[PDB]
Structures are given as structure tokens and as C-alpha cells.
PDB file of C-alpha atoms in Angstrom:
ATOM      1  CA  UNK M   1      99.065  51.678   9.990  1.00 25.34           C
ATOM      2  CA  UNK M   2      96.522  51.863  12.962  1.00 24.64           C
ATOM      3  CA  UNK M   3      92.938  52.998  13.220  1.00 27.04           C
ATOM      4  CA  UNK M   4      90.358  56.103  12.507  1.00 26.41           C
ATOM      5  CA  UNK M   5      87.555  58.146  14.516  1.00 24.76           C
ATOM      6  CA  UNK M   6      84.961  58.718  12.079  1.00 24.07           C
ATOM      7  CA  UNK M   7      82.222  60.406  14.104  1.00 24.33           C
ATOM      8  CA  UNK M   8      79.239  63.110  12.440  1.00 20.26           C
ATOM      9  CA  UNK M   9      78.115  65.989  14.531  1.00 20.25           C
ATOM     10  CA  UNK M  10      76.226  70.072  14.829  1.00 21.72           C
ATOM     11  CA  UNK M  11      76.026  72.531  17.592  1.00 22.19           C
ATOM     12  CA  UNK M  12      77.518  71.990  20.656  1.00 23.11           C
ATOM     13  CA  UNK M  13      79.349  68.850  18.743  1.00 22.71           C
ATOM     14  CA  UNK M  14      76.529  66.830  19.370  1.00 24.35           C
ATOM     15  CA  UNK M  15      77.537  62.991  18.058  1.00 23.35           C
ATOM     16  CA  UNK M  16      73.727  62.336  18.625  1.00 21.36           C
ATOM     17  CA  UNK M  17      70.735  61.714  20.670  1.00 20.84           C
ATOM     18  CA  UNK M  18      69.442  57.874  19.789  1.00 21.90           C
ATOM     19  CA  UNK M  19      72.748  55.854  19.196  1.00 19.06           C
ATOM     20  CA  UNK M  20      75.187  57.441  16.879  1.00 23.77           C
ATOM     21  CA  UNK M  21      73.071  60.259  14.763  1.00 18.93           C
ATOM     22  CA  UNK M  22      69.669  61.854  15.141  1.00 18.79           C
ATOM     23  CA  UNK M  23      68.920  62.248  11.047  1.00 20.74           C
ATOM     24  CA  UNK M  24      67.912  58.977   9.796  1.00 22.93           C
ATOM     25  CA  UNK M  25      71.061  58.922   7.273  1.00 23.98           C
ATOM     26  CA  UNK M  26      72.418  60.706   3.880  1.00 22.95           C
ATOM     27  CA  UNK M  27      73.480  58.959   0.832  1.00 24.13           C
ATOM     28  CA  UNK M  28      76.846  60.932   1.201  1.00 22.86           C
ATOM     29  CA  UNK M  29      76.819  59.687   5.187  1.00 22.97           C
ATOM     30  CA  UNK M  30      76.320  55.721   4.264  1.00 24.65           C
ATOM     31  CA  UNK M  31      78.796  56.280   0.992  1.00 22.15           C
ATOM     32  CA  UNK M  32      81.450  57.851   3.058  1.00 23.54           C
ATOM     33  CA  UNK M  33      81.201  56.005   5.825  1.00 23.39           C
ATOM     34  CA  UNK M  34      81.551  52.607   3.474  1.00 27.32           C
ATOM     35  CA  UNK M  35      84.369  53.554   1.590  1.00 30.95           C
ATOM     36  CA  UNK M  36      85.977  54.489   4.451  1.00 32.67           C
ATOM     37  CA  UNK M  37      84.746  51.810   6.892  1.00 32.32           C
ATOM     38  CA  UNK M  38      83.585  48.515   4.631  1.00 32.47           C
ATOM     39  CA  UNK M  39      86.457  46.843   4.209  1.00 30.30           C
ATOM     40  CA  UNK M  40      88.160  47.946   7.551  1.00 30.81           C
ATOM     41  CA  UNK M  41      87.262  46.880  11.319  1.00 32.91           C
ATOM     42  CA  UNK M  42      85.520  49.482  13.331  1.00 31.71           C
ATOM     43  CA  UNK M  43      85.946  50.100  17.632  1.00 30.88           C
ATOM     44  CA  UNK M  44      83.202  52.084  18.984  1.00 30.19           C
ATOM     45  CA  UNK M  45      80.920  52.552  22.400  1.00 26.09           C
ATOM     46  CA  UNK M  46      77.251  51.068  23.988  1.00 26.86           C
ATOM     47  CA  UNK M  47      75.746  54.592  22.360  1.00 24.43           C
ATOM     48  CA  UNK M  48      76.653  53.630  18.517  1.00 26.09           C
ATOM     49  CA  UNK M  49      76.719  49.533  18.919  1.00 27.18           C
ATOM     50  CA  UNK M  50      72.963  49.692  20.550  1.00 31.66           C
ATOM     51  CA  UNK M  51      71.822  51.234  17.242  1.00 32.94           C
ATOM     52  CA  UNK M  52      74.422  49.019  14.873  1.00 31.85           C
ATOM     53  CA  UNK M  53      73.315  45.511  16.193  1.00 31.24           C
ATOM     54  CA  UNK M  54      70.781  46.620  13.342  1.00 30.22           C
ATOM     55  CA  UNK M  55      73.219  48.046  10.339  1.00 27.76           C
ATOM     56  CA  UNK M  56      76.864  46.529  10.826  1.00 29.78           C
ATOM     57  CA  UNK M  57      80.215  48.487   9.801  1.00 28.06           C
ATOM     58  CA  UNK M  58      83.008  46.743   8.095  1.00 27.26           C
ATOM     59  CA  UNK M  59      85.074  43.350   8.396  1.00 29.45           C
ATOM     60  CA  UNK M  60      84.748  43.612  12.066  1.00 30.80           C
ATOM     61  CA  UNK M  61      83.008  45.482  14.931  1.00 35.01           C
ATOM     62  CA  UNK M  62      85.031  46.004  18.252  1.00 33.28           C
ATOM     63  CA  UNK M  63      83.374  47.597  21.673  1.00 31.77           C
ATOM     64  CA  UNK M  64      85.361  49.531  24.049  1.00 37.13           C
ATOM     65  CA  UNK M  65      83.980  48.306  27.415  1.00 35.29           C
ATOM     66  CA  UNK M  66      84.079  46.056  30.257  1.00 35.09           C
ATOM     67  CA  UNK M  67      81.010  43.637  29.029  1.00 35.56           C
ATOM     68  CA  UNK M  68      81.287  39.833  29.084  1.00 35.43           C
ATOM     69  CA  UNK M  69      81.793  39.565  24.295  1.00 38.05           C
ATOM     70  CA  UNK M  70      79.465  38.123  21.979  1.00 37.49           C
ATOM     71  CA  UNK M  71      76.844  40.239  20.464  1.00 42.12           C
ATOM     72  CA  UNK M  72      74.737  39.307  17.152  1.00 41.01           C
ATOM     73  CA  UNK M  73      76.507  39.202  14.168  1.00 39.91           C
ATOM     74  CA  UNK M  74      80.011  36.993  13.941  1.00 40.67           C
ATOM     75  CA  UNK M  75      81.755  39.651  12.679  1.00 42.82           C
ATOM     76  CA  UNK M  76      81.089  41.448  16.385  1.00 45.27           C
ATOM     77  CA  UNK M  77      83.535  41.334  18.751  1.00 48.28           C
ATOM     78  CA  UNK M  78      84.975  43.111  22.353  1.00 50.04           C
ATOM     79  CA  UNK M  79      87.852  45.239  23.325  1.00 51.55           C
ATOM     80  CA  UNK M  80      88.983  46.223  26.945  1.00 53.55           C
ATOM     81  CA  UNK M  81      91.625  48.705  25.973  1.00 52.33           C
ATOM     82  CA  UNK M  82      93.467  50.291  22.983  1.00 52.96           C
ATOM     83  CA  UNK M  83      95.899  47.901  22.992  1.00 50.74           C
ATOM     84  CA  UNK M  84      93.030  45.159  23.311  1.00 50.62           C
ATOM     85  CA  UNK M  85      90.975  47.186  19.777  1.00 49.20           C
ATOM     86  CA  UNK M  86      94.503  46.979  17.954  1.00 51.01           C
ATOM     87  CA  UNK M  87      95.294  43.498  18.973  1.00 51.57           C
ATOM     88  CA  UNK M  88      91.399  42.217  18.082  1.00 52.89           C
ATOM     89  CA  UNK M  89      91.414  44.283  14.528  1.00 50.31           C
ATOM     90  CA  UNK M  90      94.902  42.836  13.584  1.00 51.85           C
ATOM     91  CA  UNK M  91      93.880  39.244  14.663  1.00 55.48           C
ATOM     92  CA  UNK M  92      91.288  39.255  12.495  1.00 57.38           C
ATOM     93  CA  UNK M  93      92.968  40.300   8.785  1.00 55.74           C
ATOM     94  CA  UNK M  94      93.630  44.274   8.502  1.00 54.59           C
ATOM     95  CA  UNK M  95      96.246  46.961   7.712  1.00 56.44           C
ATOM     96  CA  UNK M  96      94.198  49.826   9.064  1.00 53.41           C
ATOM     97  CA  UNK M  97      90.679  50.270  11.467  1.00 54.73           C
ATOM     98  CA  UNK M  98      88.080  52.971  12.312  1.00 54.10           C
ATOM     99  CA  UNK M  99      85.865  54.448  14.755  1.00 52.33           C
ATOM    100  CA  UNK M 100      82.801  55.539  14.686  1.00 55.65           C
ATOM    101  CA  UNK M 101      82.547  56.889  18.599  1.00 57.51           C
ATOM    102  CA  UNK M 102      81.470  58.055  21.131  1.00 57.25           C
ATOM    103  CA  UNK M 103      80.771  59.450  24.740  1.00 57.00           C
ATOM    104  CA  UNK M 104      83.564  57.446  25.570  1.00 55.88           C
ATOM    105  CA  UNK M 105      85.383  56.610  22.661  1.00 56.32           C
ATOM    106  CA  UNK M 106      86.715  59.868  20.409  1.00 60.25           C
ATOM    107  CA  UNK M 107      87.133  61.281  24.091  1.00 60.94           C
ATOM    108  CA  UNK M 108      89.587  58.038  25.040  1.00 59.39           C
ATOM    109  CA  UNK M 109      91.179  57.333  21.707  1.00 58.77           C
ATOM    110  CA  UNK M 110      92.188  61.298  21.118  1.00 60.28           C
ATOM    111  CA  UNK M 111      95.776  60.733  21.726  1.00 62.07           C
ATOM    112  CA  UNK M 112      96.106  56.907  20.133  1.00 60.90           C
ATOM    113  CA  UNK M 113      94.285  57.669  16.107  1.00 58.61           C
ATOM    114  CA  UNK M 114      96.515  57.829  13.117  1.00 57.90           C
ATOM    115  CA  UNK M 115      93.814  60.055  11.952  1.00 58.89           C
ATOM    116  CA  UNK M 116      90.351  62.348  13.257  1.00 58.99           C
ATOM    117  CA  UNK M 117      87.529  61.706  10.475  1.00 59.35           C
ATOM    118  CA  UNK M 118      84.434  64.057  11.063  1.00 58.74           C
ATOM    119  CA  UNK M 119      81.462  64.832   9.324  1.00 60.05           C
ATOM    120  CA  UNK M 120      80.551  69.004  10.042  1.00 59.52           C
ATOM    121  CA  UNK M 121      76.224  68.192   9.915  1.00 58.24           C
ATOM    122  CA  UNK M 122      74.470  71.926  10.479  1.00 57.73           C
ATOM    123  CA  UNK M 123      70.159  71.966  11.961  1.00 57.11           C
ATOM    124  CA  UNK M 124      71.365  73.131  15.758  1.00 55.97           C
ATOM    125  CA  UNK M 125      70.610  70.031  18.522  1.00 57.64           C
ATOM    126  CA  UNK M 126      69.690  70.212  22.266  1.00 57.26           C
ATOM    127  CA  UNK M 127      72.485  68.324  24.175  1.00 53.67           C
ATOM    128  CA  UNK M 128      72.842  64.367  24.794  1.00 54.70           C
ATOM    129  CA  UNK M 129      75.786  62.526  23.004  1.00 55.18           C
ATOM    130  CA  UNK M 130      79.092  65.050  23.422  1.00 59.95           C
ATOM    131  CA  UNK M 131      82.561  65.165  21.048  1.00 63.84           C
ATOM    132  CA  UNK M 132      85.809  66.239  22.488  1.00 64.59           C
ATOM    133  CA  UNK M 133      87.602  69.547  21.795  1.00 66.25           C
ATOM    134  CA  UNK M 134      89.810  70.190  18.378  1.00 64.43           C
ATOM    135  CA  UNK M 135      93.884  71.551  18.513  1.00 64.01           C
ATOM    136  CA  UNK M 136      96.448  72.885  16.872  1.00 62.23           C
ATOM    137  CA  UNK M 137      99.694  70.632  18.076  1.00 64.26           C
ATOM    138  CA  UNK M 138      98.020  67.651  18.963  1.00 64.18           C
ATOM    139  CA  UNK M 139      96.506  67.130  15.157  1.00 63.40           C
ATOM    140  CA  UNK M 140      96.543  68.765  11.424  1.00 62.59           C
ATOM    141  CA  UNK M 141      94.268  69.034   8.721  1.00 60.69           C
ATOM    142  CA  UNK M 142      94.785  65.899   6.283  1.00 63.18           C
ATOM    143  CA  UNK M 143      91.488  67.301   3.916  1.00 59.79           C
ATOM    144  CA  UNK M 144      88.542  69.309   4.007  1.00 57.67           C
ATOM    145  CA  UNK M 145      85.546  68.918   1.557  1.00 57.33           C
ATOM    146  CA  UNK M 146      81.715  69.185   0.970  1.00 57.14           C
ATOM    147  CA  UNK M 147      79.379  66.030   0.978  1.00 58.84           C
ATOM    148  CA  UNK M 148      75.423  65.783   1.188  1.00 60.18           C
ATOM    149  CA  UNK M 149      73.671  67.466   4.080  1.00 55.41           C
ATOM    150  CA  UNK M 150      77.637  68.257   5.812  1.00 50.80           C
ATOM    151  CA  UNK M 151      81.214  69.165   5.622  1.00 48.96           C
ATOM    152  CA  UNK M 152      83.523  66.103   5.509  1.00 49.91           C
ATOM    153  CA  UNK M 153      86.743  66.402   7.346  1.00 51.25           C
ATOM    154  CA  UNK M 154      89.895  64.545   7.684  1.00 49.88           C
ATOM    155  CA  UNK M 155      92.617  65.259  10.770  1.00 46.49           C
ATOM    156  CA  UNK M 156      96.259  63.746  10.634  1.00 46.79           C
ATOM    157  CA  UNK M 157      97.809  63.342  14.112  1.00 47.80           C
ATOM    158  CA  UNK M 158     101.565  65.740  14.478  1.00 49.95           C
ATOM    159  CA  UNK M 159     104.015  64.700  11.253  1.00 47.70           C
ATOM    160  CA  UNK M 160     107.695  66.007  11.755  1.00 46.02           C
ATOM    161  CA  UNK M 161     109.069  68.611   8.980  1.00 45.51           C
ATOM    162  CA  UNK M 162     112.013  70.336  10.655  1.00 45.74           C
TER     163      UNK M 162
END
């Protein structure tokens, strides 16, 4: 298909204040996150890849930038554009990618995602790491269910019906 945001978040829709989260992480966050991402390539931002040059993603890990490549682990990798993320995550071996994202990234991907993945984390935060705005024509609900610490939530991008 193509790729996935997959991005968790509180009040305001704070993404975090560190990298990507401000909680350490769940059980239900790192078991989520690596059925979802473990297998698949992920594209994501200086905020979340600062942090994951510690814990890695999946099969690949793209940036969204204008740096020069090369990173720390060989599966670590850079993308100039959307078209550049897609290209690098297909070269590679995959059917589908994610995202975790970003102060850039959820708010330049938006319109290019076959789906939204979010994680609904409550506690109330002050304001450093932002997440775009949610519609109603743009993108659907695919599911909606309870994990540990959070809501997990799935968005599908507009299907035609009639």
C-alpha cells in the first residue's frame, strides 16, 4: 500500500517534550508500536530520531530533512521528500511503512498517509512538541480501542461508497 503516522499524545496534542514522548514508555506503547512498526520501515523528524539513535523502529528508519545521510545503525537512512520516504522504504524490501512524527512530519505527511495511527495518552502537558488538527472529509475512523496508560486509534484516509 503506502505508509502510517503512528504518533502518542495529551492536552493540547502534545507529541512530547524530550524526543518523541515525555513518559518513559508502556508495555501497551512498545507492544503496539512493534506490531505495528517491527517489521515495517518507519519516516520520522530530528525530534523522534535524536531520541531513537538509542531504541530503533523496524526494518528501516527514514528522516524527513535536508541533512547530509548516515546516522548509527545500518538500518538508518534519509529522505528529502515524500516521494524520496516512499522511494527509500520500497528500495529496501516492504509492502507498507510508518511514522512515528513529528513537528514536522504528521503536519507534512497529513494529506499523503494511507492511514492516521494515534495513541489518546491523558496526565495534561505544558506545550513543546505540537500534532496537527483532526477532520471529518479529509480522514475516517478505521478503529478505536483501549490499551495501557491510553486510547489507541486508527484513521483511514476518504474511501468512496456512492
Amino acid at each position: 500500500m503506502e505508509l502510517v503516522s503512528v504518533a502518542a499524545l495529551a492536552e493540547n496534542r502534545v507529541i512530547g517534550r524530550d524526543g518523541e514522548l515525555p513518559w518513559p514508555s508502556i508495555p501497551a506503547d512498545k507492544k503496539q508500536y512493534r506490531s505495528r512498526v517491527a517489521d515495517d520501515p518507519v519516516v520520522l523528524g530530528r525530534t523522534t530520531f535524536e531520541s531513537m539513535r538509542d531504541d530503533l523502529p523496524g526494518s528501516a528508519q527514514i528522516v524527513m530533512s535536508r541533512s547530509e545521510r548516515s546516522f548509527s545503525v545500518d538500518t538508518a537512512h534519509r529522505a528529502a521528500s515524500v516521494e524520496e520516504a516512499v522511494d527509500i522504504a520500497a528500495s529496501l524490501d516492504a509492502e507498507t511503512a510508518y511514522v512515528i512524527g513529528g513537528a514536522a512530519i504528521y503536519a507534512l505527511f497529513q494529506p499523503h498517509l494511507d492511514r492516521m495511527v494515534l495513541s489518546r495518552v491523558p496526565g495534561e502537558y505544558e506545550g513543546d512538541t505540537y500534532y496537527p488538527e483532526w477532520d471529518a472529509a479529509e480522514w475516517e475512523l478505521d478503529a478505536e480501542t483501549d490499551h495501557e496508560g491510553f486510547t489507541l486509534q486508527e484513521w483511514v484516509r476518504s474511501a468512496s461508497s456512492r
